[PDB]
């Protein structure tokens, strides 16, 4: 619509046209043909363990990273009960486990158990949201170091990582743990 | 709050610090000492009929006009039953009546009879709003020729005048017709 959110987002942030990178996706994940959506398999599929593939975390990256400027993309979470989204550094550990935290180069928030919204921080912070979002705007300002999440239907705030001193390229990152009927999808 | 509306308005538009100009105010209007608020008198007060004073329309202007750039200010309408706000050209007719319309250099919207939201256009357009606003953001982009009005509490759209070819300086303008307990006030 013509809400200040919808009208101004592109005046202020360049719209990322985020395409999921199948080379990065944990083998338990399915990337849609159009590369906009991700689902989970009952079992890991048989894929190479090429270096760019997350082999433990149920993660997938966008094809393109950012090293400067202002950028946004939107994700339809719909009625999923579990998801995490945000950005991560190019050089995160993709083989084995590391805690997904800003100290290990992940800046993400999401939902677990249907209704626990949280930042993936050390320690985890609980978010109290006016309503459950269906669509989440993810907003990067590389130079000020701000990663902001909004409800993309009413423009309400969800969370901001403030004043981070990024020194790596940053990828859109997505994680799904659960096997559910609703996918996680990028709006183009 | 940290809504996209509140966070982004100042990144994109310079906040006007709009002060009411008592020299411009129809003598039936009272301008507050702090020059942020306007009320109506039962009767016209005794004032000079200096050239900058609106002598028929129950109008008052901001002290400063714009000839370029992006600007905004916010107005608390509260539970008033009647008000109109927007911008007008420096050279509007201030002595006698002219219809307040874009053709006569007024770009305004507002409320009449408690619940008829309308643009002051020829002909008048009725606005259907999700909810009655309490605070209205007024947004000027001189070069693209856009004057946009938002609900300043949830960032929802109210109205836009699109692609106007301004060639005069533009003043914030305000009009109140009714005698009611609630004033019309500028947020600083």
Numbering used by the authors:
A (entry chain A), B (entry chain A): 18 to 205
What do the study authors state?
BTN3A1 has the structure of a type I receptor of the Ig superfamily and is part of a family of seven BTN receptors encoded by genes in the MHC. BTN molecules are composed of two Ig domains (IgV, IgC2), a single transmembrane domain, and a large carboxyl-terminal domain termed B30.2 (or PRYSPRY) located in the cell cytoplasm. More recently, the activation of human Vγ9/Vδ2 T cells has been linked to BTN3A1. Published reports show that BTN3A1 acts as an Ag presentation molecule for HMB-PP and IPP, but the mechanism remains poorly understood.
Therefore, we investigated the structure and binding interactions of the BTN3A1 B30.2 domain. The crystal structure, like that of the B30.2 domains of TRIM21 and TRIM5 (13), shows it to be composed of layered antiparallel β sheets with variable loops, a structure homologous to the Ig fold. The juxtaposition of B30.2 domain variable loop residues forms the specific binding interface. The BTN3A1 B30.2 domain structure has also been presented by Sandstrom et al., who identified a credible pocket implicated in binding pAg ligand, characterized by a cluster of positively charged residues. In addition to the residues highlighted by Sandstrom et al., particularly arginine residues at R412, R418, and R469, histidines H351 and H378 and the single lysine K393, our apo structure suggests a role in coordinating Ag for tryptophan residues W350 and W391. In particular, the indole of W391 may form a hydrogen bond with phosphates in the bound ligand. Binding of HMB-PP and IPP to the BTN3A1 B30.2 domain was investigated by ITC. HMB-PP was found to bind with an affinity of 1.1 μM and IPP with an affinity of 672 μM, values that are similar to those reported and that help explain the 1000- to 10,000-fold difference in bioactivity of the two molecules on human γδ T cells. IFN-γ production from T cells was rescued by coculture with wild-type BTN3A1 and N115D re-expression, but not by the B30.2 domain variants H351R and W391A, nor by the Δexon5 and ΔLL deletions. In addition, the IFN-γ recovery response to HMB-PP by reconstituted wild-type cells was less efficient than for zoledronate. These data therefore provide functional confirmation of the critical requirement for the B30.2 domain, of key residues within this domain implicated in pAg binding and for the BTN3A1 periplakin interaction motif residues, in pAg-dependent activation of γδ T cells, with the likelihood that additional unidentified factors are required.
